Write a protein that binds this ligand. Structure first.
Ligand SMILES: [Co+2]
Ligand SMILES: [Co+2]
Ligand SMILES: [Co+2]
Ligand SMILES: [Co+2]
Lengths: 324, 324
């Protein structure tokens, strides 16, 4: 009936049109050490984050899931400010990123102590059922992530802890896959450990252009997310044209009740500002929160995708995902 | 001749008896993500850190160099609270840790952008000559660190930026070596990029028990630190008995003017509290700030080491190190 947002419990039936994977803030681990030159400018950051939220609202978005990992600058209190200003529902996560873009030393050390996996489960339970730090905000999803071609031993600790927490709480799991790998493997591993496929979203699935890879993942009964719309020009990433091609094939096969769409935007980068070099910068120009609504959805409609199917993906699926 | 401390400039002639490598606070990268169960409690932490400072003061210590890396929870304002309460001089660092206990994703990303090395130099210069964040505190040393058996491409960016910053500022460089490797290589690499050997301390040298490894390093004209006293059993670490054996051999060889001693304590751990298992816990029982004075120095004097030699290491060498 209810889901935890940054403003507290909200009825699942009130979530409405949802973006399943966007970041208001995000930083690569290590950004914290560059505080002198890469200061967090909260006022400007809030202005930018609120502007992004308003752009989403303009296209009927009422809810956003922000799965910023705990080790990547997650800031629930900041999200609450965005939500308070805009009236958007924002659902945050508990979880760590994958090894290559994460900060593994801490839980690797606890693994040497023999307690890491239990500590992670304890962290998930605390943040799902008690609150994050002193904010009073509970996470509404568990974020999991794996490496390219491998769910590492470090990563598997989180996967097992997540399955355990899910069995206890009924919490939704949202995942990151790296470079179009491990979708089927994540689903199989989570299900081995008793996780509920109807509560799992395997992310970044659109990074792989082989429809058989998607169908192998869909076979487990999980949700999949095409959540990289706008990300073009590598590393390895396919084009939006290719993403649309893959999506159309799955919709023709009747998989709409298992698919959600997003952009995985980073609206405010933590640390120093940066500029992409020009070939890449132009290829990435559509990576913003309006892209699905201005470009992608019109293209789907051009191919004959019905409004009810679009509504299934943006409204029906998040409602079902967060319902018992 | 002055050095920057957490309280501002202090005459080098007033540093007196110094511990070259101790941490009031330290966290393994990723500790930030375990904030809920591992919150930093400032009042209690300050009480503990102040007590550690008072323990050092009782043995005549007037100065501590705290080289906590930027990515390992460095908190200069906290150090200033400790120093303001106790009158201890505390000198802090600018730098990142080695890959295996560091947070490389941030500067790895900036390396891809082509700016990392310049960004690191910029950071070093800002923190040595202007201030850290909004604290008004300047770092007095640059902290460098390498991995086991190699200085990685990531680490080398910091090494080159450090040499550049040293040429400009005359700043002292303090290093970490991993598992008794890369001592000579660090010295060679820094001098090859124009760093001053009389301003370099190669750290954790006591983790290697081969006196030829030490003599190879010492031949570069650099300082070396036996800075792991009390750390026994963990990750290939030698015993204190073995450390004393190596140290005695070098002192009898006439190397006193190049050697400094410390414990590399962590007085307050960031993140969740932990307890070491029973075999390791007993082995680590002497890992505290009084150990050199209560146990090690008496062991050295029992082996014929005179007060003048000890004073050279604890007083003479730090004064020379920080002098032009
Ligand atoms: Co991701
Ligand atoms: Co993401
Ligand atoms: Co070290
Ligand atoms: Co240290």
């Amino acid at each position: 009936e209810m889901v935890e947002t940054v403003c507290g419990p909200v009825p699942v039936e009130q979530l409405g049109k949802t973006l399943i994977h966007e970041h208001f803030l995000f930083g690569y681990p290590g950004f914290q050490g560059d505080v002198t030159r890469g200061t967090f400018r909260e006022d400007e950051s809030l202005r930018v984050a609120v502007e992004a939220a308003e752009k989403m609202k303009r296209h009927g978005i009422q809810t956003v899931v922000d799965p910023t990992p705990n080790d990547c600058g997650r800031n629930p209190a900041f999200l609450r400010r965005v939500a308070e200003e805009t009236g958007l529902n924002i659902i945050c996560a508990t979880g760590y990123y994958y090894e290559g873009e994460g900060a593994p030393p801490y839980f690797q050390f606890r693994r040497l102590l023999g307690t890491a996996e239990d500590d992670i489960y304890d962290m998930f339970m605390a943040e799902l059922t008690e609150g994050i730090a002193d904010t009073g905000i509970k996470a509404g999803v568990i974020k999991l992530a794996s490496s390219k071609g491998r769910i590492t031993e470090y990563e598997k600790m989180f996967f097992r802890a997540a399955a355990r927490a899910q069995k206890e709480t009924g919490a939704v799991i949202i995942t990151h896959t790296q470079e179009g790998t491990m979708g089927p493997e994540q689903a199989a591993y989570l299900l081995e450990h008793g996780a509920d496929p109807k509560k799992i979203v395997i992310g970044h699935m659109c990074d792989n252009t082989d429809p058989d890879y998607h169908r192998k993942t869909l076979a487990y009964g999980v949700y999949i997310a095409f959540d990289h719309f706008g990300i073009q020009g590598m590393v390895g990433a396919p084009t939006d044209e290719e993403r649309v091609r893959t999506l159309l094939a799955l919709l023709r096969d009747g998989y709409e009740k298992q698919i959600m769409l997003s952009h995985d935007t980073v609206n405010v980068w933590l640390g120093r500002p940066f500029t992409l070099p020009e070939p890449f910068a132009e290829m990435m120009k559509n990576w913003h929160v309006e892209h699905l609504f201005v470009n992608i959805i019109p293209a789907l409609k051009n191919e004959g995708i019905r409004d009810e199917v679009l509504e299934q993906m943006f409204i029906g699926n998040p409602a079902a995902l967060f319902s018992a």
